Amino acid sequence: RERMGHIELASPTAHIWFLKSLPSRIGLLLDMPLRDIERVLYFESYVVI
C-alpha cells in the first residue's frame, strides 16, 4: 500500500498541469504565448535554443 514504482521515459514529456491550467506556468516563465507552446510541445513548429 506504500511502495511506488517508476517508469523511465525514453523522451521527456511536459506535465499537463503546468501547461494547460491557465495561466500556463511554462508560458509565463518563458514569456511566450500558449499557442506556440502547444505547437512545439505537440510537434508542430521548431524552436531555437
Binding site: 500500500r1 511502495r3 525514453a10 523522451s11
Partner: protein, 48 residues
Amino acid sequence: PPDLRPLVPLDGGRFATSDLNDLYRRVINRNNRLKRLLDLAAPDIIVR
C-alpha cells in the same frame, strides 16, 4: 501502489480493470514502442 488500484474478482473468474490500470498499460505500451522505434534508427518524421 497496486492496492490503491486493485483488481477485484467479479465472482465469475474475471477481473474488473481499473481506469488507472488501463492508462498505465497504454503509457507503458507507448513507451516500449517508442523505445523500439528509437533503437531501430527510424527517420525523423516517424519518431516525431
